[PDB]
Amino acid sequence: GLTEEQRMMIRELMDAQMKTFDTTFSHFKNFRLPGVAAKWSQVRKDLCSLKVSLQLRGEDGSVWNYKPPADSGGKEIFSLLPHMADMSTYMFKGIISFAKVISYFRDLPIEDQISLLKGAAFELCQLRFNTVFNAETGTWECGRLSYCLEDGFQQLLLEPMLKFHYMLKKLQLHEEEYVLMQAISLFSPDRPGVLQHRVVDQLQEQFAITLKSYIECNRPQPAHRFLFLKIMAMLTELRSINAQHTQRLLRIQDIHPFATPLMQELFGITGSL
Numbered sequence: 001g002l003t004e005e006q007r008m009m010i011r012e013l014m015d016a017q018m019k020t021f022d023t024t025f026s027h028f029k030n031f032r033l034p035g036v037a038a039k040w041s042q043v044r045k046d047l048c049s050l051k052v053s054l055q056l057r058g059e060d061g062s063v064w065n066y067k068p069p070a071d072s073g074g075k076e077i078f079s080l081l082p083h084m085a086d087m088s089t090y091m092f093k094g095i096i097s098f099a100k101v102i103s104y105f106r107d108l109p110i111e112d113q114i115s116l117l118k119g120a121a122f123e124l125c126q127l128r129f130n131t132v133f134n135a136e137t138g139t140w141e142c143g144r145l146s147y148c149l150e151d152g153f154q155q156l157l158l159e160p161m162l163k164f165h166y167m168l169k170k171l172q173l174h175e176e177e178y179v180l181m182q183a184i185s186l187f188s189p190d191r192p193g194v195l196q197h198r199v200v201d202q203l204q205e206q207f208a209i210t211l212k213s214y215i216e217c218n219r220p221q222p223a224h225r226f227l228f229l230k231i232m233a234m235l236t237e238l239r240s241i242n243a244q245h246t247q248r249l250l251r252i253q254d255i256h257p258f259a260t261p262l263m264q265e266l267f268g269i270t271g272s273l
Protein backbone atom coordinates (compact mmCIF):
# COMPACT_ATOMS: atom_id res chain seq x y z
CA GLY A 1 0.00 0.00 0.00
CA LEU A 2 3.10 2.13 -0.32
CA THR A 3 3.72 4.51 -3.18
CA GLU A 4 6.44 3.65 -5.67
CA GLU A 5 8.48 6.48 -4.15
CA GLN A 6 8.06 5.01 -0.67
CA ARG A 7 8.98 1.53 -1.93
CA MET A 8 12.14 2.86 -3.57
CA MET A 9 13.00 4.79 -0.41
CA ILE A 10 12.84 1.65 1.74
CA ARG A 11 14.77 -0.23 -0.91
CA GLU A 12 17.59 2.32 -0.92
CA LEU A 13 17.79 2.25 2.90
CA MET A 14 17.79 -1.58 3.09
CA ASP A 15 20.47 -1.59 0.39
CA ALA A 16 22.63 0.85 2.36
CA GLN A 17 22.03 -1.20 5.54
CA MET A 18 22.95 -4.51 3.81
CA LYS A 19 26.15 -3.00 2.42
CA THR A 20 27.41 -1.28 5.56
CA PHE A 21 26.18 -3.27 8.60
CA ASP A 22 28.61 -6.13 9.23
CA THR A 23 26.16 -8.05 11.43
CA THR A 24 28.75 -10.73 12.25
CA PHE A 25 31.36 -8.09 13.19
CA SER A 26 33.84 -10.15 11.13
CA HIS A 27 35.96 -7.10 10.33
CA PHE A 28 36.08 -5.76 13.88
CA LYS A 29 39.71 -6.58 14.64
CA ASN A 30 42.90 -5.33 16.28
CA PHE A 31 40.92 -3.89 19.19
CA ARG A 32 42.35 -3.20 22.62
CA LEU A 33 41.37 -5.35 25.60
CA PRO A 34 41.49 -4.68 29.36
CA GLY A 35 44.99 -5.26 30.72
CA VAL A 36 45.98 -8.74 31.82
CA ALA A 37 37.81 16.12 42.91
CA ALA A 38 34.03 16.27 42.49
CA LYS A 39 34.77 15.58 38.82
CA TRP A 40 36.01 12.10 39.77
CA SER A 41 32.94 11.46 41.94
CA GLN A 42 30.73 12.13 38.91
CA VAL A 43 33.01 10.24 36.50
CA ARG A 44 32.70 7.43 39.07
CA LYS A 45 28.91 7.56 38.73
CA ASP A 46 29.17 8.02 34.94
CA LEU A 47 31.14 4.81 34.36
CA CYS A 48 29.14 2.46 36.65
CA SER A 49 26.02 2.91 34.49
CA LEU A 50 27.02 0.41 31.76
CA LYS A 51 28.60 -2.62 33.51
CA VAL A 52 29.26 -5.55 31.18
CA SER A 53 31.37 -8.64 31.04
CA LEU A 54 33.01 -9.58 27.77
CA GLN A 55 33.25 -12.94 26.01
CA LEU A 56 35.52 -13.64 23.02
CA ARG A 57 34.94 -16.89 21.17
CA GLY A 58 37.85 -17.95 19.00
CA GLU A 59 37.44 -19.73 15.68
CA ASP A 60 39.19 -22.73 17.25
CA GLY A 61 36.47 -23.05 19.88
CA SER A 62 38.39 -21.39 22.71
CA VAL A 63 36.60 -18.84 24.89
CA TRP A 64 38.13 -15.88 26.72
CA ASN A 65 35.86 -14.26 29.33
CA TYR A 66 36.52 -10.96 31.13
CA LYS A 67 34.74 -9.96 34.34
CA PRO A 68 35.27 -6.30 35.24
CA PRO A 69 36.48 -5.06 38.63
CA ALA A 70 34.40 -3.41 41.32
CA ASP A 71 34.70 0.33 41.83
CA SER A 72 37.24 0.74 44.65
CA GLY A 73 38.41 4.35 44.28
CA GLY A 74 41.07 4.01 41.59
CA LYS A 75 41.77 3.96 37.85
CA GLU A 76 40.36 0.41 37.50
CA ILE A 77 37.04 1.95 36.42
CA PHE A 78 38.77 2.87 33.11
CA SER A 79 39.91 -0.64 32.11
CA LEU A 80 37.25 -1.11 29.42
CA LEU A 81 37.38 2.38 27.88
CA PRO A 82 39.98 1.66 25.17
CA HIS A 83 38.07 -1.44 24.08
CA MET A 84 34.75 0.39 23.95
CA ALA A 85 36.40 3.26 22.07
CA ASP A 86 37.58 0.77 19.41
CA MET A 87 34.08 -0.69 19.20
CA SER A 88 32.45 2.71 18.99
CA THR A 89 34.88 3.69 16.28
CA TYR A 90 34.20 0.53 14.30
CA MET A 91 30.46 1.11 14.59
CA PHE A 92 30.78 4.79 13.64
CA LYS A 93 32.68 3.89 10.48
CA GLY A 94 29.79 1.66 9.46
CA ILE A 95 27.28 4.42 10.20
CA ILE A 96 29.23 6.97 8.19
CA SER A 97 29.38 4.46 5.30
CA PHE A 98 25.62 3.89 5.63
CA ALA A 99 24.87 7.59 5.33
CA LYS A 100 27.22 8.08 2.36
CA VAL A 101 25.39 5.39 0.30
CA ILE A 102 22.05 7.09 0.71
CA SER A 103 21.14 9.38 -2.20
CA TYR A 104 19.10 11.77 -0.03
CA PHE A 105 22.18 12.11 2.15
CA ARG A 106 24.97 12.47 -0.39
CA ASP A 107 22.88 15.16 -2.17
CA LEU A 108 23.15 17.40 0.88
CA PRO A 109 25.98 19.94 1.15
CA ILE A 110 29.10 18.44 2.72
CA GLU A 111 28.80 20.77 5.73
CA ASP A 112 25.31 19.50 6.51
CA GLN A 113 26.40 15.88 5.98
CA ILE A 114 29.06 16.37 8.66
CA SER A 115 26.69 18.17 11.03
CA LEU A 116 24.09 15.41 10.67
CA LEU A 117 26.61 12.62 11.30
CA LYS A 118 28.03 14.45 14.32
CA GLY A 119 24.48 14.78 15.64
CA ALA A 120 23.21 11.25 14.99
CA ALA A 121 26.16 8.82 14.80
CA PHE A 122 25.64 7.70 18.38
CA GLU A 123 21.90 7.22 17.84
CA LEU A 124 22.34 5.10 14.75
CA CYS A 125 24.99 3.06 16.58
CA GLN A 126 22.47 2.26 19.33
CA LEU A 127 19.76 1.37 16.81
CA ARG A 128 22.14 -1.10 15.16
CA PHE A 129 23.20 -2.51 18.54
CA ASN A 130 19.57 -3.06 19.43
CA THR A 131 19.23 -5.49 16.57
CA VAL A 132 21.91 -7.72 18.13
CA PHE A 133 20.56 -7.28 21.67
CA ASN A 134 19.23 -10.45 23.30
CA ALA A 135 16.69 -9.32 25.85
CA GLU A 136 16.36 -12.81 27.35
CA THR A 137 20.05 -12.94 28.35
CA GLY A 138 20.79 -9.21 28.60
CA THR A 139 23.56 -9.65 26.01
CA TRP A 140 24.64 -7.78 22.86
CA GLU A 141 25.83 -10.54 20.51
CA CYS A 142 28.41 -9.09 18.23
CA GLY A 143 29.51 -12.14 16.27
CA ARG A 144 32.39 -13.67 18.21
CA LEU A 145 32.25 -10.94 20.89
CA SER A 146 29.47 -10.88 23.48
CA TYR A 147 28.75 -8.11 26.00
CA CYS A 148 26.65 -9.35 28.91
CA LEU A 149 25.04 -7.16 31.56
CA GLU A 150 26.25 -7.94 35.07
CA ASP A 151 23.43 -8.95 37.41
CA GLY A 152 17.74 -7.00 39.65
CA PHE A 153 16.27 -6.51 36.18
CA GLN A 154 13.98 -3.79 37.55
CA GLN A 155 17.09 -2.01 38.86
CA LEU A 156 18.74 -2.18 35.41
CA LEU A 157 15.78 -0.52 33.65
CA LEU A 158 16.54 2.55 35.79
CA GLU A 159 19.54 3.29 33.55
CA PRO A 160 17.99 5.09 30.53
CA MET A 161 20.18 3.37 27.94
CA LEU A 162 19.33 -0.11 29.16
CA LYS A 163 15.62 0.62 29.47
CA PHE A 164 15.78 1.91 25.90
CA HIS A 165 17.23 -1.35 24.56
CA TYR A 166 14.71 -3.51 26.40
CA MET A 167 11.73 -1.35 25.43
CA LEU A 168 12.76 -1.10 21.77
CA LYS A 169 13.43 -4.83 21.51
CA LYS A 170 9.92 -5.45 22.89
CA LEU A 171 8.38 -3.73 19.88
CA GLN A 172 9.66 -6.62 17.70
CA LEU A 173 10.47 -4.33 14.77
CA HIS A 174 11.23 -5.47 11.21
CA GLU A 175 14.57 -4.72 9.54
CA GLU A 176 12.69 -2.15 7.46
CA GLU A 177 11.42 -0.33 10.55
CA TYR A 178 14.91 -0.23 12.09
CA VAL A 179 16.42 1.28 8.97
CA LEU A 180 13.63 3.88 8.75
CA MET A 181 14.33 4.82 12.39
CA GLN A 182 17.99 5.24 11.41
CA ALA A 183 16.98 7.56 8.57
CA ILE A 184 14.61 9.59 10.73
CA SER A 185 17.35 10.03 13.32
CA LEU A 186 20.00 10.78 10.68
CA PHE A 187 17.87 13.43 8.93
CA SER A 188 17.14 15.49 12.03
CA PRO A 189 16.94 19.15 10.89
CA ASP A 190 17.70 20.59 14.32
CA ARG A 191 21.20 19.25 14.96
CA PRO A 192 23.80 21.95 15.70
CA GLY A 193 25.25 23.50 12.57
CA VAL A 194 22.70 22.33 10.00
CA LEU A 195 22.14 24.95 7.28
CA GLN A 196 19.64 23.28 4.90
CA HIS A 197 17.16 22.91 7.75
CA ARG A 198 14.19 23.08 5.38
CA VAL A 199 15.50 20.40 3.02
CA VAL A 200 16.46 18.13 5.91
CA ASP A 201 13.11 18.63 7.62
CA GLN A 202 11.31 17.73 4.39
CA LEU A 203 13.39 14.56 4.02
CA GLN A 204 12.76 13.56 7.63
CA GLU A 205 9.02 14.00 7.20
CA GLN A 206 9.04 11.78 4.11
CA PHE A 207 10.92 9.08 6.05
CA ALA A 208 8.45 9.29 8.93
CA ILE A 209 5.50 9.16 6.50
CA THR A 210 7.04 6.13 4.81
CA LEU A 211 7.41 4.45 8.20
CA LYS A 212 3.81 5.29 9.18
CA SER A 213 2.57 3.84 5.89
CA TYR A 214 4.79 0.76 6.12
CA ILE A 215 3.24 -0.04 9.51
CA GLU A 216 -0.30 0.59 8.29
CA CYS A 217 0.10 -1.71 5.30
CA ASN A 218 1.96 -4.56 7.04
CA ARG A 219 0.87 -4.60 10.72
CA PRO A 220 -2.89 -4.99 11.23
CA GLN A 221 -2.63 -6.68 14.63
CA PRO A 222 -4.07 -5.09 17.80
CA ALA A 223 -0.63 -5.37 19.39
CA HIS A 224 0.68 -2.86 16.83
CA ARG A 225 -1.93 -0.19 17.36
CA PHE A 226 -0.06 3.06 17.89
CA LEU A 227 3.23 1.36 16.89
CA PHE A 228 4.26 4.32 14.75
CA LEU A 229 3.74 6.69 17.66
CA LYS A 230 5.61 4.37 20.03
CA ILE A 231 8.56 4.33 17.63
CA MET A 232 8.59 8.11 17.32
CA ALA A 233 8.52 8.41 21.11
CA MET A 234 11.52 6.05 21.34
CA LEU A 235 13.40 8.25 18.86
CA THR A 236 12.72 11.26 21.07
CA GLU A 237 14.02 9.27 24.04
CA LEU A 238 17.05 8.16 22.05
CA ARG A 239 17.87 11.80 21.36
CA SER A 240 17.72 12.54 25.09
CA ILE A 241 19.98 9.53 25.82
CA ASN A 242 22.34 10.82 23.12
CA ALA A 243 22.61 14.18 24.89
CA GLN A 244 23.17 12.51 28.28
CA HIS A 245 25.94 10.32 26.91
CA THR A 246 27.67 13.11 25.00
CA GLN A 247 28.00 15.08 28.23
CA ARG A 248 28.95 11.92 30.09
CA LEU A 249 31.74 11.11 27.61
CA LEU A 250 33.10 14.66 27.54
CA ARG A 251 33.42 14.52 31.35
CA ILE A 252 35.31 11.21 31.26
CA GLN A 253 37.43 12.41 28.33
CA ASP A 254 38.34 15.51 30.30
CA ILE A 255 39.92 13.58 33.18
CA HIS A 256 40.95 10.37 31.35
CA PRO A 257 41.51 10.69 27.58
CA PHE A 258 40.21 7.79 25.52
CA ALA A 259 38.41 9.08 22.39
CA THR A 260 39.94 7.84 19.14
CA PRO A 261 40.61 10.41 16.40
CA LEU A 262 37.31 9.51 14.71
CA MET A 263 35.43 9.99 17.96
CA GLN A 264 37.21 13.30 18.58
CA GLU A 265 36.16 14.47 15.13
CA LEU A 266 32.54 13.44 15.77
CA PHE A 267 32.50 15.07 19.21
CA GLY A 268 34.19 18.29 18.04
CA ILE A 269 37.48 17.79 19.92
CA THR A 270 40.12 19.89 18.17
CA GLY A 271 43.34 18.40 19.57
CA SER A 272 44.44 21.63 21.32
CA LEU A 273 44.60 22.03 25.12
Ligand SMILES: C/C1=C/C(=O)c2c(C)coc2C/C(C)=C/CC1
Pocket residue numbers: 050084085087088125126129140147161162
Ligand atom coordinates in the same frame (compact mmCIF):
# COMPACT_ATOMS: atom_id res chain seq x y z
C1 LIG B 1 25.10 0.55 26.59
C2 LIG B 1 26.22 -0.08 25.83
C3 LIG B 1 27.27 0.62 25.39
C4 LIG B 1 27.47 1.03 24.02
O1 LIG B 1 26.58 1.62 23.40
C5 LIG B 1 28.71 0.74 23.29
C6 LIG B 1 29.39 1.63 22.37
C7 LIG B 1 28.96 3.00 21.94
C8 LIG B 1 30.47 0.95 21.96
O2 LIG B 1 30.55 -0.29 22.53
C9 LIG B 1 29.45 -0.40 23.34
C10 LIG B 1 29.27 -1.72 24.00
C11 LIG B 1 28.04 -2.47 23.55
C12 LIG B 1 28.18 -3.95 23.47
C13 LIG B 1 26.89 -1.87 23.27
C14 LIG B 1 25.67 -1.83 24.13
C15 LIG B 1 26.07 -1.56 25.59
